[PDB]
Amino acid sequence: AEAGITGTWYNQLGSTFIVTAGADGALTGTYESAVGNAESRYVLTGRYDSAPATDGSGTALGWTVAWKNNYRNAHSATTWSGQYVGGAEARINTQWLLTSGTTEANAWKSTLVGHDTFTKV
Amino acid sequence: AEAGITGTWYNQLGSTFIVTAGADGALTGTYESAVGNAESRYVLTGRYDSAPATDGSGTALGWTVAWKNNYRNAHSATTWSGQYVGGAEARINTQWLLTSGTTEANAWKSTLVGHDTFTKVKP
Amino acid sequence: AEAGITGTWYNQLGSTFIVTAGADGALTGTYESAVGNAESRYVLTGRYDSAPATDGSGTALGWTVAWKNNYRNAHSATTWSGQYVGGAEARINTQWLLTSGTTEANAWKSTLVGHDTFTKV
Amino acid sequence: AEAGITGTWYNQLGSTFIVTAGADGALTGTYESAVGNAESRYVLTGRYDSAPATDGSGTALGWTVAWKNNYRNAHSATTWSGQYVGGAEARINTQWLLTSGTTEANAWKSTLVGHDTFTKVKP
Numbered sequence A, C: 001a002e003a004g005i006t007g008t009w010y011n012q013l014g015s016t017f018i019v020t021a022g023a024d025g026a027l028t029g030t031y032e033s034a035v036g037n038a039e040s041r042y043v044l045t046g047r048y049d050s051a052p053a054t055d056g057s058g059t060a061l062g063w064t065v066a067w068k069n070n071y072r073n074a075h076s077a078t079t080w081s082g083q084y085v086g087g088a089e090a091r092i093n094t095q096w097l098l099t100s101g102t103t104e105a106n107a108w109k110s111t112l113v114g115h116d117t118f119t120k121v
Numbered sequence B, D: 001a002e003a004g005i006t007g008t009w010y011n012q013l014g015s016t017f018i019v020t021a022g023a024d025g026a027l028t029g030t031y032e033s034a035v036g037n038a039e040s041r042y043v044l045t046g047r048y049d050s051a052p053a054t055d056g057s058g059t060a061l062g063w064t065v066a067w068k069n070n071y072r073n074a075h076s077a078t079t080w081s082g083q084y085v086g087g088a089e090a091r092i093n094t095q096w097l098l099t100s101g102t103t104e105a106n107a108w109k110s111t112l113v114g115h116d117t118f119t120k121v122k123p
């Protein structure tokens, strides 16, 4: 795959993901979150496994965003792991982990988990 | 800090992580897994939040590895989210998500979750 | 809350969750999965926090299903953690962990994570 | 096995788990957390898969704790999913999900994820 991963996608919270997939598995772009201690665009970097497998499977991929930019520094980073499914309606179905930097004392509650579904709609 | 993160790290499974942290919050390197449908090294890219806080908080970061290289293609990708704690014995504590590409029907069992702790080797 | 948690709910995979909420926080019932190494009904037990909080929040709850019954024994168990939201369309939004029993060697890949949304529709 | 699981267990944070495993695959007991918006004991209910396999596999199980008792109401619930490994030093290795009740708008940050390892105390 790689196919139509490039583009501007949006998730159910109204966040915008603008990405470019390189033919060798790299993903680059920017992220703008509609929620959280975030504002404006953030740099993202990831990878996607091409050469996926005939049995109409999705393409595994993942990316990271460290929430620091020239506007805010939320001392956290999020990683999204999921797969791309194309067709008439293409989607990127993910599960993410958002880790904030804590002291040892609070390390037990440093990580949130959630799921996001992206479309070009 | 970039310097503290740059280096060779190993985790409890015997996997290897070689990374360099750029002043821009970038992370690039290779990962070698001791387990799984993997062989040789794989490229990794990630980011880390460059200006943490003062205090004794960890530095948040995350990176991704798509499990495809010249020797093998597992059709999966793993992302590690965690924090770096420097010091005499520095550690990177993480939780990860491993998604395999599946058909729509099997998408419910596409992701594995786990945690890994990495120890830095001297240098 | 507790309100209308009792009932028969269904999720996006077509699984059926039949539960009874006791006024003291207990949840009891049976589960039938439309997918996996499962067949017929399985016993479930859980808890839900009542006395929830005015700011129209959901009610936190969770439950477990060990996948052994008189038909199959899949040597695994799933726990769903989420919150109930009622109203005209009530839903139970969850994230689950499915752990299978492995040898130490395979312990690194014993746990799957996912999300299910239940409705009475 | 029911007998092996029944007992008092503690985890790395200093929390206490007292449980009894019924021959029907049931688990009942109390949990006391060393951290969080919690105080005193809380009731727990769960299940465990009674007939594991022969082999040196773990026994899968899980339990839930809603964080409400006579002294405090945190409006949250935690579920622990993991496996029991018996032996001279028995352990229960788990991963957990802690969901707080939120408004629809904040539902994206309602769940925390983590892992705990429990060690059995003699008796």
Ligand SMILES: O=C(O)CCCC[C@@H]1SC[C@@H]2NC(=O)N[C@@H]21
Binding pocket: A011, A013, A015, A032, A033, A034, A035, A036, A037, A038, A067, A074, A076, A078, A096, A098, A114, A116, D108
């Ligand atoms: O608050 C923070 O720490 C920074 C913003 C986090 C926004 C999160 S990342 C996962 C979820 N998906 C989104 O589009 N935004 C939230």
Ligand SMILES: O=C(O)CCCC[C@@H]1SC[C@@H]2NC(=O)N[C@@H]21
Binding pocket: B011, B013, B015, B032, B033, B034, B035, B036, B037, B038, B067, B074, B076, B078, B096, B098, B114, B116, C108
């Ligand atoms: O089997 C695969 O799909 C590729 C190899 C996965 C190895 C995983 S990623 C998380 C965990 N950490 C490691 O060091 N190895 C395993």
Ligand SMILES: O=C(O)CCCC[C@@H]1SC[C@@H]2NC(=O)N[C@@H]21
Binding pocket: B108, C011, C013, C015, C032, C033, C034, C035, C036, C037, C038, C067, C074, C076, C078, C096, C098, C114, C116
């Ligand atoms: O295959 C197994 O180990 C037993 C069946 C597991 C079915 C799972 S649990 C989470 C998800 N939600 C469902 O309704 N079914 C699957």
Ligand SMILES: O=C(O)CCCC[C@@H]1SC[C@@H]2NC(=O)N[C@@H]21
Binding pocket: A108, D011, D013, D015, D032, D033, D034, D035, D036, D037, D038, D067, D074, D076, D078, D096, D098, D114, D116
């Ligand atoms: O703060 C709350 O919402 C209630 C207390 C939560 C304590 C958690 S549950 C997971 C982890 N394991 C423990 O032993 N304590 C923390």
